[PDB]
Symmetry: C5
Subunit: 307 residues, 5 copies
Amino acid sequence: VSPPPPIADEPLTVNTGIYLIECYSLDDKAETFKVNAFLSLSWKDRRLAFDPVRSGVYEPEAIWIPEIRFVNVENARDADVVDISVSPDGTVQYLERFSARVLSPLDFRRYPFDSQTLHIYLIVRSVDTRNIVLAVDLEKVGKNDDVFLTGWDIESFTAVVKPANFALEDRLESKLDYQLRISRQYFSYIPNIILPMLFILFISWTAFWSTSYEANVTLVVSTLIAHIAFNILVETNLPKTPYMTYTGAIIFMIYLFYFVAVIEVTVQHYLKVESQPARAASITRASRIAFPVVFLLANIILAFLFF
Amino acid sequence: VSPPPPIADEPLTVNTGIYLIECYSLDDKAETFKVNAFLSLSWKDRRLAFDPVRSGVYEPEAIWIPEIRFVNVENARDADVVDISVSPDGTVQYLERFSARVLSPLDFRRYPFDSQTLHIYLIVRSVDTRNIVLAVDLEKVGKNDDVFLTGWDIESFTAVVKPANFALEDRLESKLDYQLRISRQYFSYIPNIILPMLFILFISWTAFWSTSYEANVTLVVSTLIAHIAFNILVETNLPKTPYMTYTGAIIFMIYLFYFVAVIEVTVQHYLKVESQPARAASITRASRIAFPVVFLLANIILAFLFF
Amino acid sequence: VSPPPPIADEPLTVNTGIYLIECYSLDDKAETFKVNAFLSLSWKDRRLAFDPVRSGVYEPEAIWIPEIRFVNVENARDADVVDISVSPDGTVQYLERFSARVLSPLDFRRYPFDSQTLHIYLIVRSVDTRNIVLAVDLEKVGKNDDVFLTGWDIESFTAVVKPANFALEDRLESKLDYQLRISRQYFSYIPNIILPMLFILFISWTAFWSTSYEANVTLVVSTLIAHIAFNILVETNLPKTPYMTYTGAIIFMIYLFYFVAVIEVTVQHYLKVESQPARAASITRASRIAFPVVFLLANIILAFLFF
Amino acid sequence: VSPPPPIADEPLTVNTGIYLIECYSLDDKAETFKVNAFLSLSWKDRRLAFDPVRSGVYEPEAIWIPEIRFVNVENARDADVVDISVSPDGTVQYLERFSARVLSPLDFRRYPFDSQTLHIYLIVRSVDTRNIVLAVDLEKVGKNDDVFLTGWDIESFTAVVKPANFALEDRLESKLDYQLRISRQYFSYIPNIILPMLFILFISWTAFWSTSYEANVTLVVSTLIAHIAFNILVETNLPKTPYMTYTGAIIFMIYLFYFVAVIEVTVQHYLKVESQPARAASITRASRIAFPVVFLLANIILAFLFF
Amino acid sequence: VSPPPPIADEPLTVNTGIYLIECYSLDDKAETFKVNAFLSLSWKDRRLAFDPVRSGVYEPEAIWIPEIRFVNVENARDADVVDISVSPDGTVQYLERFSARVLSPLDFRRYPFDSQTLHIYLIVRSVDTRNIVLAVDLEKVGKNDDVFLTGWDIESFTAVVKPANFALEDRLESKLDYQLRISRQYFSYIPNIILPMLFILFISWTAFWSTSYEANVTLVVSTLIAHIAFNILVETNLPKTPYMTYTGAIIFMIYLFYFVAVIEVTVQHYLKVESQPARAASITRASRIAFPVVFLLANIILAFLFF
């Protein structure tokens, strides 16, 4: 059935909204997330007019539901219409429970302190008889009172009718932009990734307050092994990230500091075996303060360069 | 076919129940579990009335089965109707074997001693001619006499007709709440996760009853490596859990105690090499009792703070 | 088309059988296995009677094939009928190549020496006009002459028409029980899991025939690390098993023996440094024989308690 | 539409062939491989005869394509007919691009030097009016000029019309056998699996040219840890293989040699501490040559027993 | 509906193009990548001619869309037509949003400095009434202004109408070649794979500036363990690659250099214990410069042999 033509040849406005239900999948490796939600559409048409008797109501296929199609989805959405209603004044609104995979990029520049923006794009199948324009119902758009992206904080949930569109579309269409900006609770990462990685480094550094090579070399190289094994343990948390992250920059600094610690221990032993205990003691005493200070500085510059 | 209108314009009650069969999938990482079960529905209608001859019986599509739709499912349920029957007094009951993924959150605040509640939500496609209300058949709802969630204990299986519903639904509907509360057999975890993690720590602590740095540092750092490798081994059991768990809090305490053990061994060696054997002996003898006592205390406070 | 009514109002018997082809998937983590097989059904009906000319034969949908439905399947079976035949005396037999996931529990109480029983359940959609009862064709049921569950031994393949059924079914139905009991070739596990796990333990024990603490502690703790790493290597073989297995009990005994070995080495060093070489020598010499004997005993009790 | 009856009541021959395109999936763990290929069928029928005008040609469903069904497939093939043609003399040949998972067993008796045979089985739905027999078109069967199973060498690609068939089929059918025999390029495995595994063993053996227990025990047990970690690294390459492989036999020999090396180092230290330096020196000097020679011998017997 | 016959019996040209949207999946292990894109087709037909009134426009099935079929796809593409338009002069162009898995080989000869070429192949279902030839619309073909293969650089995106085709096709068809040549940002790999692998090697080499066997052997073998563990950590980045890669050649050189380092340390200790300190000092001093120089040389030859 053709869409109802406008009375005054004015573009038809459709009020669309989403109330998220489950955001269950966040596949960082696949750079996608799977969401279940109730898509609500409102089209004002002069059809199925109601009489002042037995009112309040219809059919799943007999009423023209406009073609609302997502853009950034892997496959076509698995939709299931739940309710279809028509306002007797002529405002047909219907809600469909749909499951959809969303193809959105997650940048981990600032993991685990990241704050990302999931994106959903909407388009319509405009027809020559009547153009279709999209708006957003503020009273309808919202987020679930449920778990709501467990382990994340929903910072904002906004919609913008972006006039921009890809050049392939010969005509111009008002692509609709749902942007959901979410931060991450970073607290658990402090004792699960960051603090032990520093404890191992400090165990490495305590080799300076020692003086025996056979113990310094063990205390440094074994803690290097511990750090590598802990990196193996942590890499299940981290995603693939083919680019220089922030954690991937701290970890490189830590490898570099293990290298410098080994270099120092070797130089101290070489000086002390070459009958120069004075210089060896001097360099060890200097590094006792130098290493933590250099580490603190390097982390400060790293943070300011990434934040 | 339209649902049978009420004789006295009273809401139609439907007796619904589930007898679980297989709960085979418990994908902790995906925060979902897949269940197979027999959904049984009972609608009282004045249709297909039976005669006192050749009674006891029908069709899969010729009889109006009410639209029972789950809420918290990834995709629409993969149903397969098994039996359809009608009581000659007018009570049509039918059972459908359905497979369904369920999107429910599992909180691991208290893993492995957790006790969670799986949730199933039911809604109907109410029509204006006759409203639909849902109840629960106690004689029909039940759990399988089979394996019944292997590795778990089914504490309770209850149903509540919650008047609450999400604000998107313009009308009001009686969403139906199946809550299945299950505890976990925690015994195997005691020798598979907890006890070896303590054995390694005690091997670390036995470095206090020693007096040689070249052996204390080995005995501590190598056991740190052993603990990290054992954490790698155990993390297959644990799920992702982007939040401070209970095991994730014991493990942090253990990393902290390895740090303090290394700090002590270093201080003892530094004192003993700086011609103060008395203070070194005193601190070692004190820590021999201090470390186990502090560990026991810290676990007590950790348990009371998590339980 | 309705099933043919009985001539003498006697229940209709159906001869059913399965000849397995591929058992390709054995997903221990998912507690399921995927099997491909030829399901053969034989129903005796007075339809499509043959004449003594051009005999020996039909249609995929024009002949009533009884509704044979599996019970313990994740999704409905992916069937594909291959042959449909009718015996001129009136015995229609047809074979369908079907792929099916089977939801069966595998208990690893006795891994790797386990001997499990896969289960397939069959039910029919009995109609009021004529009841349906199921039997088994011994001449038709069988297992593939092919690989036949590679790495397993098929002990038995039997069928029982169990009168028992779940209480949800209001009527009584003769659920059909295919039980396939299979043992496991355990030989490869002896050099792949068990023997190296003992070699590492013996390397740990050879620390008793030594007398230097700096070497005993290395030889014990490094072999503890080796054992943990080997456990990591082996856990790909083992499934999740949320319960105390047999291998999971040997491994706990091994962790306990590493703990006791460390305790002994520490006590021996403490005695020998406290000017009591006699008692230290006595305890070391005693443990040289005590440890292997205690291990052998503990394994004997463990086996008798698990077998 | 019924197949064309024979003119002289002779069995109908069908010329079938496959030109492989992609063999993309080789899931060793699942014991299956997924292949894309063009299945070409040629049936000679007296239908759609061509006239000497506008010749050279049809329809996807109006012409009887014989039921060619694979046997060893997980699910039914995902076919897509590409071209359908009929020779004016009466030889209709058509090619369908089909994707199919194949359930074939891969035996790793001789990994990585294995040479396996993938198998595809073909059957037809023979009808009583005219029997169907299958042959092979040599001019049509072939392998892709493309990558062609990357990392493998296609040794042979042959077809045999095996008269044998499973006993379930009441009649006799000529099951068609495509066997594709492929060897493996084993070169990369020499530096990726085999050579480092020997380098670690040689590092272990260099403990004989030493004389200090505190260094011999480290050099042996730490290399045992290195070997276990390298086995963890390599096990991603190896498949599950629930049976004694060839690599799984070298690795057992290597564990045994680590055990014997530890035993020797302990015996040498015990002799040298028990005031018998002569015997300790003798046993060390003997083992310096004994260990490599025994290893070379044992590998020779292992190869002859597996090859 | 038959395709429109040519007016002058000339082959019909179709202008086809692709504007990529998401290249979300790059499954190196599966040797495939999944892409979402808008396929745009332009066929010039003398149908649906427009009048100079209410112009600018149609139907999804009433207009003959030519059969454009990809070649190198796992399954048939999951298409969804978005827009269908006809130019009043007679140039019908339509765009379909399609999701497709692409089976293309990725060679990692030069990982991580690789530069690969993804391939898409197009064919048509040519009919005898009118032949079909394919061209490319430069103004339509393009790549997304979006993320555009995150972690990769799109070097080129070209199309060639290759006259070549596989020999199975009895006729000749103009297979269409989209080749997308993409390089990889290799920077992050320098601190994530390459630099730490060298830091560990340098820590190994600093054993030459030492003189105690009990420390040299620890410093070398423990760093061998660290290198193996780091290889385990890195192998998540690397794909399966059953062939001698470039990283897989550096890693072999590194294992070889660990072997030579152990051999040297053993020889130095053996010389120094055999009352030849002069030769031991000479060989150690020589290797101090020999090892880094040999490593630099070997990397140069390795690069020139792989680049």
